[PDB]
Amino acid sequence: SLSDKDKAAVRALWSKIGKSADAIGNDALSRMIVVYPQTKTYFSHWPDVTPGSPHIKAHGKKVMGGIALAVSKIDDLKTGLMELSEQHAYKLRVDPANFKILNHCILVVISTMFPKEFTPEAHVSLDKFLSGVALALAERYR
Amino acid sequence: SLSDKDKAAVRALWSKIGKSADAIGNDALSRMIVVYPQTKTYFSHWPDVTPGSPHIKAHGKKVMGGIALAVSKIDDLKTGLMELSEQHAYKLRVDPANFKILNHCILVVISTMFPKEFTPEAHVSLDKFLSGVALALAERYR
Amino acid sequence: VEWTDKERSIISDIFSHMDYDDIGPKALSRCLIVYPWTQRHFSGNAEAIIGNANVAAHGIKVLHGLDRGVKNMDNIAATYADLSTLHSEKLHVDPDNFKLLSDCITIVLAAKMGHAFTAETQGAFQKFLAVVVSALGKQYH
Amino acid sequence: VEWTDKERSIISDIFSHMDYDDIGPKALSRCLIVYPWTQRHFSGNAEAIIGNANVAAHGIKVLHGLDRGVKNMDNIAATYADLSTLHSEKLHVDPDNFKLLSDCITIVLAAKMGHAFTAETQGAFQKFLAVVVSALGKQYH
Numbered sequence: 001s002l003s004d005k006d007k008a009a010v011r012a013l014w015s016k017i018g019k020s021a022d023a024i025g026n027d028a029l030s031r032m033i034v035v036y037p038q039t040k041t042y043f044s045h046w047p048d049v050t051p052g053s054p055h056i057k058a059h060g061k062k063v064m065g066g067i068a069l070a071v072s073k074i075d076d077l078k079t080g081l082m083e084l085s086e087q088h089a090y091k092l093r094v095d096p097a098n099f100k101i102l103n104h105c106i107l108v109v110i111s112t113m114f115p116k117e118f119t120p121e122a123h124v125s126l127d128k129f130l131s132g133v134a135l136a137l138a139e140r141y142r
Numbered sequence: 143s144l145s146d147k148d149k150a151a152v153r154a155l156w157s158k159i160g161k162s163a164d165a166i167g168n169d170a171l172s173r174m175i176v177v178y179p180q181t182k183t184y185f186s187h188w189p190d191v192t193p194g195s196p197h198i199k200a201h202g203k204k205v206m207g208g209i210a211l212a213v214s215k216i217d218d219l220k221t222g223l224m225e226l227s228e229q230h231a232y233k234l235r236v237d238p239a240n241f242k243i244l245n246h247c248i249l250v251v252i253s254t255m256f257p258k259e260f261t262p263e264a265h266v267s268l269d270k271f272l273s274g275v276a277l278a279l280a281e282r283y284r
Numbered sequence: 285v286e287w288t289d290k291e292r293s294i295i296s297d298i299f300s301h302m303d304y305d306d307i308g309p310k311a312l313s314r315c316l317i318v319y320p321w322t323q324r325h326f327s328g329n330a331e332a333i334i335g336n337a338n339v340a341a342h343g344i345k346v347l348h349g350l351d352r353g354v355k356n357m358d359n360i361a362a363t364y365a366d367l368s369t370l371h372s373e374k375l376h377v378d379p380d381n382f383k384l385l386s387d388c389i390t391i392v393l394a395a396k397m398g399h400a401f402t403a404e405t406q407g408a409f410q411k412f413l414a415v416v417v418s419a420l421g422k423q424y425h
Numbered sequence: 426v427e428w429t430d431k432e433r434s435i436i437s438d439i440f441s442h443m444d445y446d447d448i449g450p451k452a453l454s455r456c457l458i459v460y461p462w463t464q465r466h467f468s469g470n471a472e473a474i475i476g477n478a479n480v481a482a483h484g485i486k487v488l489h490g491l492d493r494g495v496k497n498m499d500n501i502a503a504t505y506a507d508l509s510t511l512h513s514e515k516l517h518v519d520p521d522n523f524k525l526l527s528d529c530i531t532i533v534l535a536a537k538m539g540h541a542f543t544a545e546t547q548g549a550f551q552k553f554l555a556v557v558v559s560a561l562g563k564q565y566h
């Protein structure tokens with residue numbers, strides 16, 4: 001569970017990197033598809049699914065907007081992300097094993113973009129937060 | 143998260159198998175040590191750590207008593223298992239990766255002992271419950 | 285893995301006494317109820333799943349599929365190369381699903397074998413499934 | 426794994442430009458703060474961990490340890506057999522810890538390389554660490 005210390009660290013980090021949310025998502029989504037090929041299938045309806053793709057870019061904004069929502073709903077991830085959980089479980093049928101994969105790609109991207117801000121202490125709290133986000137997205141699965 | 147449906151299923155199953163808690167723990171602990179040898183080290187202070195061992199038997203009662211506690215605290219696993227979390231994290235320094243291993247061994251043992259009661263529907267709710275128990279035991283780790 | 289003679293004997297014994305027609309459907313329906321996101325593959329309730337002939341057919345195929353692994357325990361990764369490609373390339377089965385299934389196979393076997401499913405038995409059986417799961421999911425090693 | 430020439434070149438390039446003395450200690454101290462249960466091994470706060478010479482020494486050893494894998498990419502499991510035994514038998518390191526560490530190595534490298542740590546780069550690097558992690562943790566395959 002997220003402590004007040006964890007919540008404060010995540011809000012402080014997001015305050016610092018939030019401005020680059022769109023770029024973080026485009027990059028995280030690009031990596032996921034390339035490094036974990038089992039994920040490409042969920043985006044095959046897009047004309048182009050490569051790192052350069054305009055579809056990847058547009059959706060990357062939506063993924064980090066969901067992370068921004070998670071930061072605002074940090075006190076109750078289950079309730080805050082319930083609608084996104086329903087969507088991934090029922091409508092998109094995204095296998096839940098992939099949430100932790102995208103989370104790892106987001107950590108990698110934040111590290112490439114904000115080496116100074118992404119200290120080990122920022123990393124531990126953000127990782128506990130992303131685990132909570134994955135568990136919340138998994139809410140409607142079973 | 144555990145739904146009212148999940149809570150009711152876990153209480154109904156425990157009502158049925160609880161009488162054999164001691165035997166379930168002795169058996170689950172025995173299997174863990176044998177099938178996942180990295181776990182044996184935590185019990186090396188015991189004179190005998192084999193399936194037949196009297197130490198294994200005594201501790202198996204304590205492990206399933208912790209599971210019985212978890213069933214009584216099902217509405218708030220974090221608060222209910224906080225002291226056991228502290229103990230495993232700080233005093234015993236049990237690597238948290240092992241909680242899911244013992245959980246799997248408990249499912250295996252319940253299946254060998256109560257094939258009739260341990261239906262797929264009892265299994266899904268008990269598995270969500272054991273995942274919650276593992277997450278609660280992990281509370282004090284980081 | 286370097287199999288011990290005892291492991292080969294255990295695995296051989298388990299498979300020779302298993303009723304595939306019973307165990308197969310049970311393991312797969314159990315998998316579909318415990319990790320319901322796997323249901324997507326067989327839609328092309330619990331009661332419905334358990335009696336679904338399509339689910340049963342593939343559950344039985346899974347067990348016969350494990351048998352070729354049992355036949356050549358030292359050539360498992362090679363043996364499943366094609367089936368691996370089929371499930372990823374053509375079926376889009378998530379590689380995490382093989383481990384979920386498996387645990388369900390082990391649990392259903394444990395229920396059938398009861399106390400005969402000793403720790404040593406569980407260890408040999410799970411080790412064989414692990415090797416198959418690695419080949420199907422195509423793990424890096 | 427069957428390495429492509431491009432993968433060999435990527436891994437060779439990364440390792441030739443990495444400063445082990447800087448990356449090693451960072452990766453291990455990061456691992457000790459993010460998964461603090463790993464700290465038990467180096468006690469025989471965050472600020473303290475980051476400057477701890479014992480932590481630094483082993484972090485540097487880890488990177489030199491990866492180098493022998495880089496030297497023979499087709500004999501990795503054999504190469505790490507002994508180190509595997511040491512860490513389990515003598516050090517009681519939980520096998521899950523190798524994967525946690527790693528992710529920390531990858532994250533620290535990503536921070537050093539910045540945008541040069543492209544997706545293709547991350548894929549080759551993570552694939553090489555996965556193979557090493559399997560050999561150290563002694564995974565069934």
Ligand code: HEM
Pocket residue numbers: 039042043059062063064065066067084087088092094098099102103133137
């Ligand atoms: C950090 C975890 C994730 C977050 C916060 C997230 C967030 C989002 C958001 C905000 C949307 C738009 C929802 C709407 O239309 O209202 C969405 C759609 C979608 N997500 Fe996720 N998602 C996550 C993980 C995943 C993963 C792991 C995959 C697949 C491997 C995935 C696949 C999809 C797909 C395919 C769509 C629909 C894309 C389209 O048709 O345009 N999501 N997600």
Ligand code: HEM
Pocket residue numbers: 181184185201204205206207208209226229230234236240241244245275279
């Ligand atoms: C289902 C999860 C588990 C439960 C509910 C559980 C429960 C317990 C309980 C009730 C105790 C006695 C605590 C006390 O003295 O107040 C304890 C002690 C201990 N547990 Fe666990 N535990 C779990 C998992 C683990 C795992 C996974 C390991 C190691 C691989 C472990 C290792 C130990 C050891 C070594 C002791 C002390 C034994 C002794 O010195 O007698 N526990 N546990």
Ligand code: HEM
Pocket residue numbers: 322325326328341342345346347349350367370371375377381382385416420
């Ligand atoms: C030990 C694991 C498995 C084995 C040995 C196995 C084996 C097989 C076999 C023998 C076939 C027929 C293949 C062919 O026509 O050439 C098949 C088909 C298929 N498999 Fe699996 N399978 C396994 C796991 C899974 C998992 C976990 C899923 C999905 C959750 C799955 C979904 C499918 C589907 C959709 C088909 C096509 C339908 C059918 O033939 O019944 N399989 N599998």
Ligand code: HEM
Pocket residue numbers: 463466467469482483486487488490491508511512516518522523526557561
């Ligand atoms: C890629 C993974 C790793 C590699 C390549 C690696 C490499 C090494 C090497 C080269 C040594 C000296 C071995 C010898 O004296 O023969 C060593 C020692 C040791 N390792 Fe690791 N290691 C790794 C992961 C870990 C992990 C994750 C832990 C614990 C969390 C750990 C704990 C230890 C300890 C306690 C020592 C003895 C102290 C020391 O020599 O610094 N290692 N390791």
